[PDB]
Design an enzyme around this catalytic site. Structure first.
Site, short mmCIF file in Angstrom:
data_model
loop_
_atom_site.label_atom_id
_atom_site.label_comp_id
_atom_site.label_asym_id
_atom_site.label_seq_id
_atom_site.Cartn_x
_atom_site.Cartn_y
_atom_site.Cartn_z
N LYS A 5 31.57 -6.22 -5.47
CA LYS A 5 32.13 -7.07 -6.51
C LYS A 5 33.08 -8.03 -5.82
CE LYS A 5 33.89 -7.23 -11.16
NZ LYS A 5 34.41 -6.54 -12.36
N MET A 38 22.14 9.05 -10.68
CA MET A 38 23.27 8.49 -9.95
C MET A 38 24.54 8.93 -10.64
SD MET A 38 25.67 5.87 -10.47
CE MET A 38 25.18 4.26 -11.12
N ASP A 57 33.86 -10.91 -15.26
CA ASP A 57 32.72 -10.00 -15.35
C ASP A 57 32.33 -9.73 -16.80
OD1 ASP A 57 30.73 -8.32 -14.35
OD2 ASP A 57 32.12 -6.68 -13.95
N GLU A 114 28.63 -0.52 -4.47
CA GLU A 114 28.42 -1.56 -5.47
C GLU A 114 29.38 -2.71 -5.21
OE1 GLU A 114 28.69 -0.14 -9.42
OE2 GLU A 114 28.93 -2.10 -10.38
N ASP A 173 22.03 -2.42 -10.40
CA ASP A 173 22.67 -2.54 -11.70
C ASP A 173 22.20 -3.83 -12.35
OD1 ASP A 173 24.02 -0.20 -11.10
OD2 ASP A 173 26.04 -0.99 -11.45
N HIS A 190 30.75 8.41 -14.48
CA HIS A 190 31.92 8.69 -13.65
C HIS A 190 32.41 10.09 -13.95
CE1 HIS A 190 32.14 4.26 -14.06
NE2 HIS A 190 32.68 4.27 -12.86
N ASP A 230 34.26 9.95 -17.19
CA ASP A 230 33.50 9.73 -18.42
C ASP A 230 33.08 11.06 -19.05
OD1 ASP A 230 33.61 6.98 -17.66
OD2 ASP A 230 31.56 7.07 -16.85
N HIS A 286 27.83 -9.47 -10.57
CA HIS A 286 28.80 -9.56 -9.49
C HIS A 286 28.41 -10.60 -8.45
CE1 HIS A 286 30.30 -5.20 -10.37
NE2 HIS A 286 30.31 -5.99 -11.43
N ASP A 345 29.26 -8.37 -18.10
CA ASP A 345 28.40 -7.22 -18.38
C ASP A 345 27.55 -7.44 -19.63
OD1 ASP A 345 29.61 -6.07 -16.15
OD2 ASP A 345 30.98 -4.86 -17.37
N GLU A 384 24.82 -5.51 -8.36
CA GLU A 384 24.84 -5.80 -9.78
C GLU A 384 24.59 -7.27 -10.00
OE1 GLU A 384 27.90 -4.12 -12.31
OE2 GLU A 384 28.04 -6.09 -13.31
N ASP A 398 24.16 -1.61 -16.22
CA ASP A 398 25.62 -1.52 -16.22
C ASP A 398 26.19 -2.67 -17.05
OD1 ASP A 398 28.32 -1.22 -15.75
OD2 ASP A 398 28.19 -1.34 -13.56
MN LIG Z 1 30.27 -5.70 -14.04
#
Ligand SMILES: [Mn+2]
Ligand SMILES: [Mn+2]
Ligand SMILES: [Mn+2]
Ligand SMILES: [Mn+2]
Lengths: 385, 385, 385, 385
Positions: B182, B87, B254, B180, B244, B53, B56, B219, B256, B216, B286
């Protein structure tokens, strides 16, 4: 008070009030109904029409003589009541031949049979006056990952819907198709499992304009999704050809409770949307009177469906009409949400310093959205407080 | 054994191995990481690239001098390792200004700010070498039904993505966009909640070919949906721009988890599909190393991700290569599923008596699909039996 | 209309209206609140009391002087308003030390620390007037199967609760303990995940009578369970020591919506049960004003909680009072359900021929339960129709 | 390789391999099986025994002569094969009389009939050699909140189980009872919906020691709960009288997939627990061969069940035996978790300054749990890497 009338467009499947009560663990708790009796009892309740599968009306395996006679009876009853048939569908799921699907059955001859079976009922749907023909692919799916190549299955699904679209085009029919999505049950995962997946699929068809969605309250809630949002997206795309109303208590087997049960607030927002947006298609109830009921409970169930729609319709209208609601909506900037983000254009946006270099990110962060006061107003109107 | 190499295309976000461990109920359990250290440690593990991002890499609110310096450092480390940036994405969700959304925030100026913030990072993504730019609309949604007019919100979402597509078109950029999806969290319901809803949405954009999905694992499983099926439908539509990978234990927050945890069989079928279909984009992880770990556990987590992909890749290949599997697939007619249902045409189909009037519906009903033997073969290869 | 008064027993945690808005993906959208201001603003709204964690009141790491001063301030405000503190709890989840649990942390010294931290706050809870002390084991659990031997963990959980029961027994305290169950989040699976698992666990404690449940609406609904049924079973067992009220939209992350949102009908049946059964403990709201709100929205949220309880309380009472409801209940044999099945005894039952050999199984099968008419009556009263 | 033998204690219900394939949307895809053929074919596969409902063996409504003849046939086949009958159960759910429940039917005479029907089959279960008698209350529940007073229903449920416990006590029988919990389906919410709720319920019975749980993999996963954890809690309480093994793909209708499908990792941890803990009861498979199968697929399905247990059993044993696993478990302090928290006693704990005043909360916070490396080791053994 809240008495339903045919202008309300309330319709019911033959399979709804005629469900005999067999579930995966139980035998029938009610005797079969005459389609003709259903028509007349529903007309007495205030329904606008009925819908059917081919095999709800004509017993599977009827020679043309019987079939013709079953149709003449049903035709007669509609004539006597003025009952409409706005939608029909094919049963491609009960008979063991369809155990791996209809249009996406691994067996090629079953696929060709499914199309012939559906084409035969399209002719009957149109003759009876159906605007919409529904595809529920309840057997199109798998219980395990190797049993179905999903890209090939979508080739076959596309090929079947392209042929049906070529059929109604060559016959001159006005009828349009609606996919009814379902995420699972009776297959472990069903293809085109949500409104969204079906809308995406339609864009790849050869005549996309012939096809829409027939969403059901309980099927999207079986994925935990927000049924009003998905309906809003169908409406946005211009594809809300039909809709199935009922109740569902979250993620679990398909309950087909009567409409208004399950998620009461989502039913409210659904009615608010359908009425605000001006949806003018059938308010179709695809519910199941619980097998705990006798036939008196079956009709009370059917009446509750229509009654709960009309109460919600009344509460949603008073919500929108309320000036306090109008003020709360403006405090939460639902007005601004309808304003183009950048009607001035990309280049204007790019050179706007107040949109970036000089944006007070913290004054904007500090403005409360006032969603709680708005929602408590919606709650008060729903409950009549 | 199962050692990852850059040709495997394994990538990681800066936010993954750099997650400090704050969750809704807890404070950080790890100190922040230098993006530069992440790049070098991931390259040592066998990664092919990193993603980021904007925030980030560049601390929110950095003057151009700092920003330039943060980029020069990150640029330097990529040069030293040969690490790709396939990406990038924008953070439109942490800062309180985005509390009601970025592109669909009820407040018009927040929407214009979100677009300027994203345009700035597109320039950086392209300069760094990004093929895909990801939109995660984690704040586009509502907790209550009146707070968001979903049809207006989709107008704004369409308007934002149309402007970004006009931006990369006027600059001459090769980059493409991936939504993406969700279903929920951090909003109670998120717009475009599944692969399907995002694919439908893209068809209404002005330049649909610039936009794909970045699905993802976790998700879609948060909606209870079959992630391999939805990926198959993205592939079918030609829109799998990115993916993802991670783990999720069903319908809940979520998680991850690292890839291969959660639903082990679905991870297997996913790898089988990605490899059979010839997906050639990034295998992006991810995931979040659980806050129970120290930095040694963070890198062991990242390595497990790649390792579980490579074991599954090995087992799926041996499954497909196995002549017993090949025979079982033919016994279950996966071959027939790839055959046009009616390449002979509608009229031929309509006049075929063996497809209806003379169809032996009961001989067809009696042919077992042999899916169990097929699936136990897939189980044996997965477990190495 | 529906104005809350302290006799209604409505209480709120310091952490509810004082939630600053940090979620897993976002930074705080509101400044911290003075506990003292919370006390006074809640008293103005009509609350009966407040609850707290140790660290909501005393900043973690306060020397006794500060701690004493923080308590004197809070004590002062309660005195000025007459606000009760019916329940307290320990924060064993925020601080990184608790990342693997408090009472069931794999690390023995963390476990002993958790007990000392809780014992210190029991003394304060009792001094402030708490009837109930709540254990939320939000960090007792695992993300993976090998990380926690669940039988050993339940040994440690039992050992901790046995020691706390020995502590309050030796001090002479009247306080009792309530476990607040949660199925998941922040751990992937939490021990004692439902009301039922906690009730079973209490029966194995050394002084079972000192321990009850503190169920939360949203936690049981995160497992898809029926919160009124589970409350009925806690009441049946005599263990409803406390209750947390809020809203949840099904199976997904813990939303802590205000009470009445989420599942509106289940909130109705909950209030009907609590009032019919004569529950006399706190109506505690463990909700979170959405981070979209400013402080004005925070108090409107808190007021909505109490308001929705009082509307439901009014509708449930009119339901029970309605003679048409009374008649419908008898038509559905809720009366017979309260009749002993076989007060005549086993031997009488065994020799009754009308209970088996001469039972008309088909006349009994044919009696409809009339549940639909009953439920539509409950719907009409809820909506005010 | 992984060949099942009767010492493995693998058992199957008559209703499993004898499922004819009727689901809520479909007709039977297979002809009925002779119980006697099931016995012999299962013995050929390596099963240890069979289980039955009364009505799987004796057609409902059989005079004693037929009934006796059906039992003599079944008795004969068991004699010829050495097949055990470790568990039996009553069908209190198919027949329409049970549409509102058996033991908690609102209608008193149905309740007395259910008890007589069950007592009759207890005599037969014991004569045939059953150690466990299972109660599945699939019809004990409601679709709506007013239809069932849950506290009265639990009175009737307790009264029924108390009478059955008085019956087997007066007859001198060794048999014990196991409740099989299910959260929902065929009722919208089922009473005693999870292992936990059933364990709590048993503690209120008059002879608690006569009653345990018979948990099913898929039923706890239909609530999203961790089946290994709940089994660990049943084991902890000393109540794992029996267990039903099968597969389930999350929260959705009851799939009854074969064991090892659904959640592969949870099946692994389940086998690891059952084998580590030394469970010595039946490994009972309560699965359904998908209706897509012929009878050849039915037996391949039954064999897969046993085969997947034995592969997991092999992988879990190698996991525990592996010294690298042993070292990783110690690095994650599973050893410390088995250590009494405070065997030194409350007063010692209270005066320990190293447990509070001098606890280095930050050195403890900084010790990573090393759960990722442990879990990747479990993954490697499961996959055979
Ligand atoms: Mn996630
Ligand atoms: Mn349905
Ligand atoms: Mn909560
Ligand atoms: Mn089952």
């Amino acid at each position: 008070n809240y008495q339903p009338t045919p202008e309300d467009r309330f319709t019911f499947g033959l399979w709804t009030v005629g469900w005999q009560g067999r579930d995966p663990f139980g035998d029938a708790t009610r005797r079969a109904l005459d389609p003709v009796e259903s028509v007349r009892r529903l007309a007495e309740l205030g329904a606008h029409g009925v819908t059917f599968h081919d095999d709800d009306l004509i017993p599977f395996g009827s020679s043309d003589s019987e079939r013709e006679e079953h149709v003449k009876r049903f035709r007669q009853a509609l004539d006597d009541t003025g009952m409409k048939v706005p939608m029909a569908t094919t049963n491609l799921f009960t008979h063991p031949v369809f155990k791996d699907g209809g249009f996406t059955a691994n067996d090629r001859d079953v696929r060709r049979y499914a199309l012939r079976k559906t084409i035969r009922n399209i002719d009957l749907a149109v003759e009876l006056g159906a605007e919409t023909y529904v595809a529920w692919g309840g057997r199109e799916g798998a219980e395990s990952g190797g049993a179905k190549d999903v890209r090939d299955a979508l080739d076959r699904m596309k090929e079947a819907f392209d042929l049906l679209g070529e059929y109604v085009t060559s016959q001159g029919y006005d009828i349009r198709f609606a996919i009814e999505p379902k995420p699972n049950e009776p297959r472990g995962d069903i293809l085109l499992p949500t409104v969204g997946h079906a809308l995406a699929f339609i864009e790849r068809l050869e005549r996309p304009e012939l096809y829409g969605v027939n969403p059901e309250v309980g099927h999207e809630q079986m994925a935990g999704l927000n049924f009003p949002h998905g309906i809003a997206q169908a409406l946005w795309a211009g594809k809300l050809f039909h809709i199935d109303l009922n109740g569902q208590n979250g993620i679990k087997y398909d309950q087909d409770l009567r409409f208004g049960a399950g998620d009461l607030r989502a039913a409210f927002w659904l009615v608010d949307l359908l009425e605000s947006a001006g949806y003018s298609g059938p308010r179709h109830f695809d519910f199941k009177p619980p097998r705990t009921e006798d036939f008196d409970g079956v009709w009370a169930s059917a009446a509750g469906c229509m009654r709960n729609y009309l109460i919600l319709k009344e509460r949603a209208a008073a919500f929108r009409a309320d000036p306090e609601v109008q003020e709360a909506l403006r405090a939460s900037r639902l007005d601004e949400l309808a304003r183009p983000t950048a009607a001035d254009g990309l280049q204007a946006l790019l050179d706007d310093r107040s949109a970036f270099e000089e944006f007070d990110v913290d004054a904007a962060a500090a403005r409360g959205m006032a969603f709680e006061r708005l929602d408590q107003l919606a709650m008060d109107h729903l409950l009549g407080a």
